[PDB]
Design a protein around this nucleic acid. Sequence first.
RNA 1: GCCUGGCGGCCGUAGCGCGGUGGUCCCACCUGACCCCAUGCCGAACUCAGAAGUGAAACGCCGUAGCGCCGAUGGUAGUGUGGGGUCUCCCCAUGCGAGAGUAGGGAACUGCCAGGCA
RNA 2: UGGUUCUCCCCGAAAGCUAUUUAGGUAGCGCCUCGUGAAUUCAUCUCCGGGGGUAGAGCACUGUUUCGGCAAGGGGGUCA
RNA 3: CGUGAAGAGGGAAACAACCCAGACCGCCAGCUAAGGUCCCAAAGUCAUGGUUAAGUGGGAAACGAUGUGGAAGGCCAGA
RNA 4: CUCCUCCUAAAGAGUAACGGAGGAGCACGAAGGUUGGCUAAUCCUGGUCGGACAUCAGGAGGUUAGUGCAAUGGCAUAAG
RNA 5: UCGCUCAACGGAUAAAAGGUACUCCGGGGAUAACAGGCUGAUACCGCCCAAGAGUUCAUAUCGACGGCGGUGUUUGGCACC
Lengths: 74, 116, 94, 136, 57
Amino acid sequence: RNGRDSEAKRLGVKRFGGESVLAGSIIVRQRGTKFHAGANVGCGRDHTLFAKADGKVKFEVKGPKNRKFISIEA
Amino acid sequence: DKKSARIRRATRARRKLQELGATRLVVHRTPRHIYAQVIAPNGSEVLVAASTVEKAIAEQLKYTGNKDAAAAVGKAVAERALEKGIKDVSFDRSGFQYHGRVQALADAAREAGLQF
Amino acid sequence: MFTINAEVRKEQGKGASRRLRAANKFPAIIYGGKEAPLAIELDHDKVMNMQAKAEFYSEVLTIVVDGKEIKVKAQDVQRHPYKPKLQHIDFVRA
Amino acid sequence: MLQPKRTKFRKMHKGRNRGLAQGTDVSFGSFGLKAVGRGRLTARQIEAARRAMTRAVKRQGKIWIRVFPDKPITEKPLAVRMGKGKGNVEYWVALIQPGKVLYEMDGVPEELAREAFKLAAAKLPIKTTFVTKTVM
Amino acid sequence: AKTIKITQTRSAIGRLPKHKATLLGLGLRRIGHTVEREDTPAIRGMINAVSFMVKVE
RNA sequence: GCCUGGCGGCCGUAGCGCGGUGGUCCCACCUGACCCCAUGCCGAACUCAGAAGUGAAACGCCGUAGCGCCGAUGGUAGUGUGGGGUCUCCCCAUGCGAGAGUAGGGAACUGCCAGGCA
RNA sequence: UGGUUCUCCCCGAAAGCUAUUUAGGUAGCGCCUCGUGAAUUCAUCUCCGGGGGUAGAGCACUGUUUCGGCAAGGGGGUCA
RNA sequence: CGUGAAGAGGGAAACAACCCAGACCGCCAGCUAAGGUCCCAAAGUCAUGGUUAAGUGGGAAACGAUGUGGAAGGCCAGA
RNA sequence: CUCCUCCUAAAGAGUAACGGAGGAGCACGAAGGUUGGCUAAUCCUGGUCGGACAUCAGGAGGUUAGUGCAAUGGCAUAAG
RNA sequence: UCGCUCAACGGAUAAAAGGUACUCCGGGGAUAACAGGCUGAUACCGCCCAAGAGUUCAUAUCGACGGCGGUGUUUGGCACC
């Protein structure tokens, strides 16, 4: 009655903290947010955060809900 | 629950001005007064501010807190920013409808010169 | 009535405290009060035949250690999961 | 025998049984039957030892079963091959670690309880000891 | 440095691939081969990674 | 230097309860809505006029640990590497080391205008 | 399917993935070899920056589970 | 992940996969690893302390049994 | 037998079995864009019919709701 | 831009079902039947607990509910020869 699964979507973090990225570089692929778009980072339609600017990757909890953001710092 | 509703409307318009990094002219309206500040792209502290609460713009007025008073602040906050060299400001409604006094204040800053 | 001899713990940790238990002692702690917590060692089968009383957990005790008696209350006891052996005692100042 | 009235899932994985138990104190009664070995208590065993305790105390004094059979053990029929999906759920066990209080009792004298917990221990596949309640 | 001496005590046959790389980074080719490495904490950590099979003097 | 207001930093040691408390300075309800405006109905809300009233509600500030929340020390769990004992599963050496729970902390702390004695 | 014939030296696999009228075949990649290029590229360890939700634990959530107190509501003889 | 495959050697009696260890060639040289040291069969009939009496060692469970460290109990006014 | 979601899956990615559970082969010219608002489920009480539940009003509660369609990640600046 | 349940979904053709105990060939212990092995769920044998039955009386005999083993005697599992 079972037997079906799907192809694995290769989600997760592609560039970790302190990594230097070019602009347009995908930083995290995700389904929901689970990671919000901080400075110099777009959200994308499937919520794929991506570097809007060259610089280093920066994760930080910030906000009234302790949500993880991702900034980009040149 | 008038303030709890209003900061809920502003806090989407307060963003896209932090993620844009735009100088915010923020307007605060109240029954009898009208306030305005110009705040830097950072969230830290203001650059110029003007209101009717200062006694300069108190008895230059027939009444504090109406649309002719909001146009008094509209010239006041704008003419005090250009002398500091601040234009290309972005207007923040701060939860008020851009209709009445706050329309009369942004209109009277666009005449006095604030680039939006 | 209950007077307990103790020695200061020189090494704390996991393998340190497993050696104390295999050598028929067991570790303890005296926290509470102004002073810093005092990691101590008791001998097992003298304290085990002393905590079988109901008033080891009720009255103030007296832990003598290197020339100091500290008026203490037993605060929490980690026992062995199934053997009748203690694994730790918490003492508070009193 | 004990069994969950409903579960969200019909079959579980096999899992493992590593570690020591979390409910290790006599919480409710006075006298306990603590497990000192490790294994699986099927609901047939828990019920057989529940009767053997109750019959020994002559329906007197309260009796707690501190464990519950909430793991569905499957078993493939005879003369069937390997594969063809997981087999069918045939009984329910409780995983038992060393230190688990299996049963509890009060309302009886202790020598009637140590007698009744000796009759229950011969129904279980797990070596067990008799423990009484401790303040702290 | 103080330049400690490290020698290999056991062999690297059944060992992890991360252990054999640590013997490469020290320079140990075989059992009994002593080697003369400087006393930095990055060599103390290489020793501690394979301390079951090296003997330092 | 307290008081209020905007904007923030920060994100429960900051929240909530409970108690006390503040007036035209500010803020709040409040007066009225005829028009700008607007409610699938209501000037409730939004909005516009203008201050007669009140600080009741809200909102600050001050109390109180009742509740969250924070939380060591030690021990335990787990575990990398190495070596051991054997149904399972552990133990030694060494490195890392929780969660829970105790002691205790805790009634937040902080960058612009205005007000009133300084 | 079976056989494949002289000698030394150097290196040295795989039995995976993905497709397949494919599953004992084959193909691309992975791993092997030889060659030619190129960067303190690579590995090890130390320090730093990271993201986890596994082990453990826990029971607020999702379910499940005992026992106690349930301010219930009312089965239940029961009254009319 | 390691070994075999594609790795011989020493040990586990014998025993691809386990333990030790990676064979270029020669030597009638030495030190070691795992394993061992009474004889087969190379090396301790080693030294000191303890244990066991079953040939346990040298196959096994629940369970049974006066095999052989800390306390507890009712007495030289008698247990 | 292709595709999606979860678990297996060992806290990066990936990872098998005739392993454990579910779904898809669309829908939508608004259910898309934007701009301006708004904030739920359940429960208590009040009670024209009206009952556990229609509607209205308050209190509690704080998303236990909702997300055109599975499940998971999300969602109050709402993605409702 | 359209036409494909080419769904066996990287799609052999536009178009395709069976029988063979009359059979054949090329291979396979890569893979079944027999027997051997491994394993013992099952089977068989023993034991523990004792509720009970046995007029009283658990253990003369039997032994519910449950527990732990042995054997390699069946039915299997596996697919090593």
